[PDB]
């Protein structure tokens, strides 16, 4: 299991519910005002909660993730949308609770090329099966990855709030610290070498869309940073080793992930913060019904520094333009 857990008491959950009334702007149509109101209102959250979130945000020895339990109950939840294009989560009370927690940690951001720049994306099963694929997506394991491995503007954190869970849908987490503990000195040194080229994810592609950084990037290393607190960039579908040993080292990371990954089945009222520099994530197979009661998460992204993406956004805008990813 996860172990890095923050459990809100009923009094803390009640304070959070009250503080959410200070966030009144439309999350989709006035994203910057919505996020700025959440950042200001987050000062009213219980100090014990704020302390834990700031410690996690600092990063040093943070475990790669933070699971938050005991959020106020999801009460009049609409049916789970059958597609992930509606942005239903963005108008629920859970999205306000998620914004308050997010804005303690850092600045919320969105990407034009990822779910049409929605402040909160609906993470719901897709019935879609493209040419290469032999299954709709939930029918296969979502492989270990860091979010936007190809992009220097990738989020620092991935935020997932659970509206409806599925008991067979396990979220898998595996930290860069867990990886390094299983490797030899030589494997660690090689993972720190720029031996992997990156490719823009197919979902980021569009007619007439050109990326300033091109379609193929790198070579880049898989590991970087401090020896005792390494950062990881990984994605087997979008990363190709420049040589046979670099390709074999990707397999070594995958085997270590299967051996050491921790799992958690997200349930209503829970929120998971993933440190996108310190951990990789994945998801098991599950069997959605597309009946209105399927697994439904609200996903959002966090960056420590909004100035790093200013060149890619408009003034008082929260959306990174596609060509800059
Ligand atoms: O469905 C999950 O548990 C995680 C999905 C995922 O890859 C994400 O949140 O980026
Ligand atoms: Fe992901």
From Swiss-Prot:
Q: Which SUPFAM superfamilies match?
A: Clavaminate synthase-like (SSF51197)
Lineage top rank: taxon: Bacteria
Binding locations of 2-oxoglutarate: 295
Key words of the record: Dioxygenase, Iron, Metal-binding, Oxidoreductase
Binding site residues for Fe cation: 145, 147, 281
Q: Name one GO molecular function term.
A: 2-oxoglutarate-dependent dioxygenase activity
Which co-factors does it depend on? Answer: Fe(2+)
Q: What is its EC number?
A: 1.14.11.-
The family classification in the record reads: Belongs to the clavaminate synthase family.
Q: What does this protein do?
A: Alpha-ketoglutarate-dependent dioxygenase that in vitro catalyzes the regio- and stereoselective hydroxylation of L-lysine, leading to (3S)-3-hydroxy-L-lysine. Can also use (5R)-5-hydroxy-L-lysine as substrate, but neither D-lysine nor L-ornithine.
- Please identify the protein, giving its name as recorded: L-lysine 3-hydroxylase
Q: Which organism is it from?
A: Catenulispora acidiphila (strain DSM 44928 / JCM 14897 / NBRC 102108 / NRRL B-24433 / ID139908)
């Amino acid at each position: 299991e996860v172990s890095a857990i923050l459990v809100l008491t009923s009094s803390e959950a009640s304070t959070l519910e009250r503080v959410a009334d200070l966030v009144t702007a439309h999350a989709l149509y006035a994203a910057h005002d919505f996020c700025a109101q959440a950042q200001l209102a987050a000062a009213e959250l219980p100090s014990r909660v704020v302390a834990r979130l700031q410690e996690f945000a600092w990063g040093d020895m943070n475990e790669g993730h933070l699971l938050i339990k005991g959020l106020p109950q999801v009460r009049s939840l609409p049916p789970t949308p059958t597609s992930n294009v509606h942005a239903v989560a963005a108008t629920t009370p859970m999205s306000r609770y998620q914004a308050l927690i997010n804005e303690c940690v850092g600045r919320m951001i969105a990407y034009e090329a990822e779910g049409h720049g929605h402040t909160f994306q609906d993470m719901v099963p897709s019935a879609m099966s493209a040419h290469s694929q032999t299954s709709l997506g939930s029918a296969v394991e979502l492989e270990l990855h860091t979010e936007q491995a190809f992009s220097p503007l990738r989020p620092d954190f991935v935020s997932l709030a659970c509206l409806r869970g599925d008991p067979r849908a396990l979220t898998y987490l595996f930290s860069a610290r867990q990886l390094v503990a299983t490797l030899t000195t030589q494997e660690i040194a090689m993972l720190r070498e720029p031996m992997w080229t990156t490719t823009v994810d197919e979902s980021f592609l569009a007619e007439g869309r050109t990326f300033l950084l091109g379609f193929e990037r790198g070579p880049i290393p898989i590991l970087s940073g401090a020896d005792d607190d390494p950062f990881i960039v990984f994605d087997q579908d979008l990363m190709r080793g420049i040589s046979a040993p670099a390709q074999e080292l990707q397999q070594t990371v995958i085997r270590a992930y299967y051996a050491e990954r921790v799992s958690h089945c997200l349930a209503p009222g829970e929120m998971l913060l993933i440190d996108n520099r310190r951990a990789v994530h994945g998801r098991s197979i599950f069997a959605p019904r597309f009946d209105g009661a399927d697994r439904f998460l609200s996903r959002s992204f966090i960056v420590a520094d909004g100035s790093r993406s200013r060149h890619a956004r408009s003034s008082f805008g929260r959306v990174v333009s596609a060509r800059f990813s």
